[PDB]
Design a protein around this ligand. Structure first.
Ligand code: CHL
Ligand code: CLA
Ligand code: CLA
Ligand code: CLA
Ligand code: CLA
Ligand code: CLA
Ligand code: CLA
Ligand code: LMG
Ligand code: LHG
Ligand code: XAT
Lengths: 152, 196, 41, 193
């Protein structure tokens, strides 16, 4: 119970929110015949709501006094999935994008009119460069060690 | 030497003077000679460890077909009890490997600078290559010709792939590596990565 | 045609194609795995 | 050399006593800063080489460890003891007054000296037995002094660190505990829980 929080599965307000949403969804269903397509859509929405609430209950989130999940970003191992892992994934993807852009910019710097290759992309060269960014951390680290990363 | 893909031109920095050079570098990691020098040693050490790891994971399990010994599988050997606690063994391993790897590291920076014994000064390793110490490390005096080095590197690469397979198979199947081979050999056309 | 291929490499067309593919991929990913708040694996 | 295969700094020629080319951070590049650092190192080594005899002998004789001797001053009216006998002047305000006055004179006297050689090895009245007659023996003596001081500093660091992990225990108690069952009472169980 970090900061006085409670698990989702033990919170009564969470169940009350689920019941209120389900009841609101079921009210509009009575206006349509069971075989009609809007009835099928509403049934699918109700099933999706139930599945979402069950999944939130299963993942061990923490609820406040209002029955809403809260995110812990202090580094506890019990909550590494809320902030740490997606952060690492985002950092990897952003580094990939930045490394690809920098490599493409460096490659065309020696051409006679480099500004022309920036508005009309050299597709084969970019495609050959795109796959290289999959190992961007190693290349960046070794470039830093050799003193090539920073312009003199 | 040989081409990893016919119809594609080998990179210029891969001149074929290294053992086991097939011109395989699509992503251009070894453009800088320092990077190639580091990566050769890295590959050598990784393969030399991987072959021993694969031998220690596979052979102590093939006992079932012979029924000689009784040892738990490679992923359960950790939980077993031993005469010493995990912490003491880990600390001793750390203490020894720190010295060993620091001694090994200094030869990459300045070759020929750690060839002399630190306590008994009359004992030294004969001069050799960076990643091939020789001397006491080669008691049987086998000649380290290029062919043997190529064989070593090929076996190391195969063992790296084997260890990756060993790690991946257990995660999805939940069993060891030898029974997966037997299950495949039972019905080859139904027991593959495609379960159906 | 070389001149037709050149017009396909201009910045706005390439950006539009890239972003359309990106949005399609993201929409499909969210359709397969809806209501994601934490990384469970 | 402190590590074979590593180049030495240009300012560490290996001629000074106890010089092994150890300066990874380069804290001694300035010639004026390096000269001061030798004096500080010698002072630290000399101070720590006197604490070790006074940290084990009282404990080995059953008078308590080195941290129990300071608890009485926190209590109101606590009186100091020596060899099991209380001292009449063991009051807290009296103890600080003599301690501050006595050392405020010697340290200020040490500060006023201006010849750098005397700030480390003043000679003269502090060497009554005449061990400084032979310059040949003097160098090996200085090397011996420098080598022992760092060992005593490391020993004091170990003393201080072991107290934090095992509160209320003495270093000799630590040695006795480790000797009984070496394979389970060691550093390992502390580093990983
Ligand atoms: C390399 C390496 C890898 C990938 C693993 C990974 C593993 N170890 Mg292991 N270990 C490794 C080296 C070492 N381990 C250990 C000590 C242990 C112990 C005591 C345990 C593991 C366990 C495990 C398993 C936990 C899942 C898994 C097979 C656990 C296990 O076997 O549970 C099934 C376990 O209890 N390892 C030591 C000695 C310090 C190693 C060197
Ligand atoms: C490399 C490598 C490493 C890290 C290990 C590590 C291990 N081996 Mg091992 N082994 C290796 C190579 C290796 N082996 C090779 C090349 C062969 C052949 C064996 C044959 C072997 C046997 C026959 C047994 C081990 C056992 C063990 C475990 C306990 C023994 C110990 O460390 O003491 C330990 C996890 C023992 C084990 O796990 O069961 C108690 C055991 O019985 N090994
Ligand atoms: C099958 C893999 C394999 C192969 C072909 C080689 C081959 C070689 N190793 Mg070697 N090595 C290996 C695995 C292998 N090693 C592993 C796993 C380790 C880690 C323990 C080492 C550690 C090692 C050291 C420390 C040294 C060598 C050296 C050598 C060379 C001379 C010794 C020799 O001919 O041994 C032939 C070996 C075999 C035919 C293996 C037979 C199988 C047995 C069970 C030679 C090229 C020496 C060198 O190059 O310098 C002179 C050297 O100093 N190796
Ligand atoms: C030389 C290496 C090698 C060898 C001989 C095998 C052999 C085998 N693997 Mg396998 N595997 C390997 C590497 C290898 N693997 C690697 C590197 C991975 C990680 C991607 C896997 C992941 C893997 C899975 C997930 C499964 C197997 C399975 C199997 C068995 C059934 C055949 C099959 O489905 O092929 C699968 C082939 C691949 C996935 C391609 C691997 C790349 C090839 C082998 C490169 C080598 C040339 C068979 C014994 C199946 C099993 O359990 O058997 C019942 C199974 O479910 N493997
Ligand atoms: C109504 C029929 C229908 C169905 C069943 C699908 C089904 C699919 N579409 Mg799709 N799509 C449709 C109509 C449909 N689409 C229409 C009308 C358009 C607009 C022209 C698109 C545009 C579209 C894009 C742009 C993308 C998909 C993708 C996908 C796949 C997402 C799963 C995935 O990435 O796994 C991997 C893929 C597979 C397992 C099989 C493919 C999935 C198989 C995505 C995809 O295939 O990712 C690579 C993707 O990027 N679709
Ligand atoms: C930097 C700001 C930021 C961040 C970190 C997020 C983060 C997230 N958004 Mg999001 N969003 C944002 C701005 C942001 N959004 C803005 C500005 C809009 C309005 C255009 C949206 C509209 C939006 C929708 C419509 C949805 C998300 C969803 C999500 C979640 C993604 C679940 C998945 O599988 O992918 C994730 C927690 C999805 C979700 O399930 O959220 C829980 C979802 O359906 N977002
Ligand atoms: C120079 C550093 C130093 C310092 C600060 C102390 C400080 C202390 N020692 Mg001490 N001691 C030292 C060196 C030092 N010692 C050395 C080198 C020896 C070996 C001869 C001893 C042998 C010793 C004994 C045998 C005893 C003390 C005791 C004490 C404590 C109170 C009485 C006393 O001696 O006052 C300091 C005054 C003069 C040193 C006090 C905390 C007593 C104690 O444990 O009190 C509870 C005690 O019984 N010391
Ligand atoms: C999708 C499928 C992708 C992979 C397709 C592989 C096709 C076959 C070529 C690779 C195998 C090969 O050349 O084996 C033969 C090679 C090379 O084996 C030997 O290696 C020596 C090394 O000094 C020399 O290069 C020898 O000339 C060479 O024959 O085997 C390996 O390199 C083993 C590890 C890689 C195995 C294949 C991974 C894919
Ligand atoms: C291992 C990887 C590097 C780790 C250290 C990174 C920092 C760089 C090295 C600092 C090592 C170091 O001691 O640098 C000392 C350096 C220079 O200090 P001065 O010029 O005052 O003294 C120089 C003399 O010591 C030279 O003999 O930087 C500083 O002024 C202090 C910076 C940290 C200040 C901290 C307290 C702030 C309040
Ligand atoms: C070291 C190793 C394994 C070591 C295992 C050891 C020591 C021990 C294992 C144990 O079992 C024991 C013995 C006993 C058990 O009780 C405990 C454990 C601990 C479980 C594997 C390495 C494994 C190493 C691997 C798999 C390396 C793969 C590299 C690849 C594929 C690179 C490809 C390319 O880089 C090129 C070549 C060129 C580029 O241009 C392009 C790309 C494509 C990027």
């Amino acid at each position: 119970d970090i900061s006085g929080l409670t698990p989702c599965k033990d919170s009564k307000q969470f169940a009350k929110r689920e019941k209120q949403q389900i009841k609101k969804l079921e009210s509009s269903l009575k206006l349509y015949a069971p075989e009609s397509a809007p009835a099928l859509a509403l049934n699918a929405q109700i099933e999706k709501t139930k599945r979402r609430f069950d999944n939130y209950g299963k993942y061990g989130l923490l609820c406040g006094s209002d029955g809403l999940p809260h995110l812990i970003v202090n580094g506890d191992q019990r909550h590494w999935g809320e902030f740490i892992t997606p952060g690492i994934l985002f950092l990897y993807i952003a580094g990939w994008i930045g490394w690809v852009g920098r490599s493409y910019l460096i490659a065309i710097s020696g051409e006679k009119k480099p500004a022309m290759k920036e508005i009309i992309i050299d597709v084969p060269l970019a495609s050959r460069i795109i796959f290289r960014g999959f190992i961007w951390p190693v290349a960046a680290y070794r470039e830093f060690l050799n003193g090539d990363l920073i312009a003199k | 030497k040989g081409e990893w893909l016919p119809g594609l031109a080998s990179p210029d920095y891969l001149t074929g003077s290294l053992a086991g050079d097939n011109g395989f570098d699509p992503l251009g990691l070894a453009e800088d000679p320092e990077n190639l020098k580091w990566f050769v040693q890295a590959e050598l050490v990784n393969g030399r460890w991987a072959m021993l790891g694969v031998a220690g994971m596979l052979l102590p399990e093939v006992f079932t077909k012979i029924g000689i010994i009784n040892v738990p599988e490679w992923y359960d050997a950790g939980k077993e009890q031993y005469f010493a606690s995990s912490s003491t063994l880990f600390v001793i391993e750390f203490i020894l490997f720190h010295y060993v790897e620091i001694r090994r590291w200094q030869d990459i920076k300045n070759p020929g600078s750690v060839n002399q014994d630190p306590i008994f000064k009359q004992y030294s390793l004969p001069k050799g290559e960076v990643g091939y110490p020789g001397g006491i490390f080669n008691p049987l005096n086998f000649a380290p010709t290029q062919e043997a080095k190529e064989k070593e590197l090929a076996n190391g690469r195969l063992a790296m792939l084997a260890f990756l397979g060993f790690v991946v198979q257990h995660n999805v199947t939940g069993k060891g590596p030898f029974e997966n081979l037997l299950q495949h050999l039972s019905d080859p056309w139904h027991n593959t990565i495609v379960q159906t | 045609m070389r001149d037709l291929k050149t017009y396909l490499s201009v910045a706005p067309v390439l950006s539009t194609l890239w972003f359309g593919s990106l949005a399609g991929l993201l929409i499909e990913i969210n359709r397969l795995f809806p209501d994601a708040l934490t990384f469970p694996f | 050399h402190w590590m074979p295969g590593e180049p030495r700094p240009a300012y560490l020629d290996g001629s000074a006593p106890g010089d092994f080319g150890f300066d990874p951070l380069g804290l001694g590049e300035v010639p004026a800063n390096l000269e001061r650092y030798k004096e500080s190192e010698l002072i630290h080594c000399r101070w720590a080489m006197l604490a070790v005899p006074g940290i084990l002998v009282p404990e080995a004789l059953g008078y308590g460890n080195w941290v129990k001797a300071q608890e009485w001053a926190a209590l109101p009216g606590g009186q100091a003891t020596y060899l099991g006998n209380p001292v009449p002047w063991g009051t807290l305000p009296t103890i600080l007054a003599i301690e501050f006055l006595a050392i405020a004179f010697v340290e200020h006297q040490r500060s006023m000296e201006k010849d750098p050689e005397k700030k480390k090895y003043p000679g003269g009245a502090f060497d009554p037995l005449g061990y400084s007659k032979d310059p040949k023996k003097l160098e090996e003596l200085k090397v011996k002094e420098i080598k022992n001081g760092r060992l005593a500093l490391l020993a004091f660091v170990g003393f201080c660190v072991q107290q934090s992990a095992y509160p209320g225990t003495g270093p000799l108690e630590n040695l006795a505990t480790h000797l009984a069952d070496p394979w389970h009472n060691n550093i390992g169980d502390i580093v990983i829980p």
